[PDB]
Symmetry: C3
Subunit: 332 residues, 3 copies
């Protein structure tokens, strides 16, 4: 009887940060209550000032990472304020039935709904908006995030031993398809209905104009670089709701990787790069061994360095000359 | 001595259906006899009426699924009637030697041939036409299918326990490259030789115009939706002879997935989405838990909803409110 | 104390050949000394005579395969002669820290440097140039190769039994983005600085003009076909520093495949085709069972047969009619 279970209210945080949770479940199964408010908003996505009309869960691209344990119930109150213009819904790849929830969560502006589903499978999973007939437009406008369903006894390695992270980050990777005129400059639009056909045309090229982490070129750099210390164990959850990606930590590895995100499977060890298929979340665990700057990229390096799919870690601590050293510095 | 083995003649069926077979082999090794007749034919592939000249095995895109057991012999009589115009052959990725058979099966119009090969490796595998110098043109004109080589003791899970499907479907995914003029409309051609250079030009864009299941937009919908009941175990074989895909059951999962199709490997568990590389067949096993409509898609959602890579399941049975429910239906 | 370890100097060979090494380590850990000299040079990459300005390690595309054992130290002397024009460096995906070495190895023309790193993880790994702000340009100009870090006790199968190759080949796959004018012909450039913006424009299409093995269309064919004999065990290392590929041996299989290249993981068995993500090296082991010509391809068959991603094996020995035979040769 679900009414007999504890309820716990989660207050979400903005990516790449993740709301507080316990890796090993400290309670029995619970109804975990989340609220998200849809926000349609202008977002500047590149250094040139390109501005799009983003469609967001909770004001961010990606939407926030939700975290529960296997066999918890996820109860989401989804709010579509009357300041928005479009119909929206939500599909959880973690859920079973009704198109992941999408068939049950269609909200016009000025409406809300509450969905509950049982998180029966452990893993990281995409969630995204999916209104009938408009699905890729909403997803590729930024309306996607992820949910992590932890095993009740936390993560395990390929031998069944515990893997415990000290820090977790959520990197959402977004492909945008900003319409171009025949000279190649972006077009802008006066209403969503006036934008729709050229959004479809742009999408049908299958060639993103921008591929970004955390909603914009450079978002995970500078004062917003990811951080760690030598010796810290970091889990990086990475999602891509629409297109394949191939994450890579420049100067590091994925020590344990669930490339397709599902924790009942043993992780892949020692990865340089891994393929997260479009429509999937994956997760990589790494223990930092060296300080300094790292780049975390999609290793289509054009996508990373020309289109935006690159962020940084800043790692503090002691340099290990046994692992790497300059024997003779560059010289004539 | 192969002449001492039983022969069994298989009568193939049109995809997405699969000819009758036994999961666990009820006999010793056999020579399994198949016949396919090549048919070049016009096919309408979209709702707009776009018509291409398809190149088919047995009149369908994809060609039919062949099913044998490991260490059976596959004996294929391949017929190229004189009503066709082109040379064709067949390459089985299940086979060993002679370019998968292609070097031994070149048939002009008005010819036939018979190939035998031993199915030494269990899995689902692509087969496709591959005439020297014209390979991607034939494949991307629809001339590809798949063969399933079952282990003699049927499928097994990651722990070695049996996995028995109640139903099986074969979804062939086809990328088409319909030539476009500089305004973007499709061109049509008067002979295959007159079409060849612009087919090559279209292919070299690496951007399909259409990506379809079972040969056309919407083919696996309406009266031709896939079906199941709550509690039924379904295997979905999915092939893509030329380009990567990322299948996903919207509202469901791949409970056990051989993404790259080879049954000696343990399946991946609990997948949301999986990557089937171009040139591969994969297979996903799912037990339905909820009734209703599901969409089965390539989860590049542009490819699914704009280019055609989407089909439906219609599932009968009882709704489980424990797994999912609307707590508060959409309202003001 | 690294100074107490043996040093061994390796003399590299041109791909697809691989310098001599032992699979099972015959010594304790060593400092393995390599030297590479960067060469910027013109290369003709197709049958039409298209000529690009390639950026190479050691004069080849790909750069040579380096081979060490786990927990050896790799000490690379990297030389940038004054006959080159550009700044270069090197990033090893096998290494830990300093962007894989790139932060420590920036060499102007007329400079050299020596980097040492400990090869702590077994696998095949990409290495590539990565100068800040110019990364995809150098990589997609050919400036990438691979390193194999063997387990000290050699390769093992999924059950922990030895896998010993008789021959090894290194296939580097290169995506080139030759700039096109609005009629579609390639452009040529008078200096690297004058080429840079249109190189970036070409790359941003995400559509390679050429995808080649060993630096050119047809490079691994004819007198330069790969060779083997029936019964020989062959390891094919395959890298792609920037874009996904899907290798396939036409007429064969990958009997044991590390698609993402890391030997602590069990190999995938019986693969037809496998996905090597951009930014990764993979390795496939096969025992030949039939003589004749094989094609080794990227199984996007457009990429293989139209853009260049195809090579050949020529295999000597006895034909096995049990595995495959023509029962009735093509006839009227
Ligand atoms: O708790 N049964 O899904
Ligand atoms: O968190 N200690 O494994
Ligand atoms: O190529 N990714 O959908
Ligand atoms: O080494 N990563 O580009
Ligand atoms: O979902 N396996 O990582
Ligand atoms: O039955 N030997 O392949
Ligand atoms: O088919 N019964 O497992
Ligand atoms: O991107 N698939 O070949
Ligand atoms: O949830 N599938 O788009
Ligand atoms: O081929 N492994 O699914
Ligand atoms: O040998 N420690 O990396
Ligand atoms: O090299 N003999 O296994
Ligand atoms: O589609 N490969 O990057
Ligand atoms: O069978 N390979 O194209
Ligand atoms: O890296 N696993 O092949
Ligand atoms: Cu929406
Ligand atoms: Cu989805
Ligand atoms: Cu054909
Ligand atoms: Cu093939
Ligand atoms: Cu360089
Ligand atoms: Cu790299």
């Amino acid at each position: 009887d679900i009414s007999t279970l504890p309820r716990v209210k989660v207050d979400l945080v903005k990516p790449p940060f993740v709301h507080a949770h316990d890796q090993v479940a400290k309670t029995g199964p619970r109804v975990v209550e989340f609220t998200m408010t849809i926000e349609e908003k202008k977002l500047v996505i590149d250094r040139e000032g390109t501005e799009i009309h983003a469609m967001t869960f909770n004001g961010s691209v990606p939407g926030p990472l939700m975290v529960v344990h296997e066999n918890d119930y996820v109860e989401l109150r989804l709010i579509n304020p009357d300041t928005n213009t479009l119909l929206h819904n939500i599909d959880f790849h973690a859920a079973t039935g009704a198109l992941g929830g999408g068939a049950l969560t269609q909200v016009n502006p000025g409406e809300e709904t509450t969905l509950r589903f049982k998180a029966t499978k452990p893993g990281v999973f995409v969630y995204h908006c999916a209104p009938e007939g408009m699905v890729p437009w909403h997803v590729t406008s930024g309306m996607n995030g992820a949910i992590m369903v932890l095993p009740r006894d936390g993560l395990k390695d390929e031998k069944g031993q515990p893997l415990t992270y000290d820090k977790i980050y959520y990197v959402g990777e977004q492909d945008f398809y900003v319409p171009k005129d025949e000279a190649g400059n972006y077009k802008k639009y006066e209403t969503p209905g006036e934008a729709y056909e050229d959004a479809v045309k742009a999408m049908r090229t299958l060639t993103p104009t921008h591929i970004v982490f955390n909603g914009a070129v450079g978002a995970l750099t500078g004062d917003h670089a990811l951080t760690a210390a030598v010796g810290e164990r970091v889990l990086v959850v990475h999602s891509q709701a629409n297109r394949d990606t191939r994450p890579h930590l420049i100067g590091g590895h994925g020590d344990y990787v669930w490339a397709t995100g599902k924790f009942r499977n043993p992780p892949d060890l020692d990865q340089e790069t891994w393929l997260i298929p479009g429509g999937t979340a994956g997760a990589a665990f790494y223990t930092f061994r060296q300080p300094g700057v790292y780049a975390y990229v999609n290793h289509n390096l054009i996508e990373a360095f020309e289109l935006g799919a690159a962020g940084h870690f800043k790692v503090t601590g002691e340099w290990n000359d046994d692992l790497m050293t300059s024997v003779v510095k560059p010289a004539s």
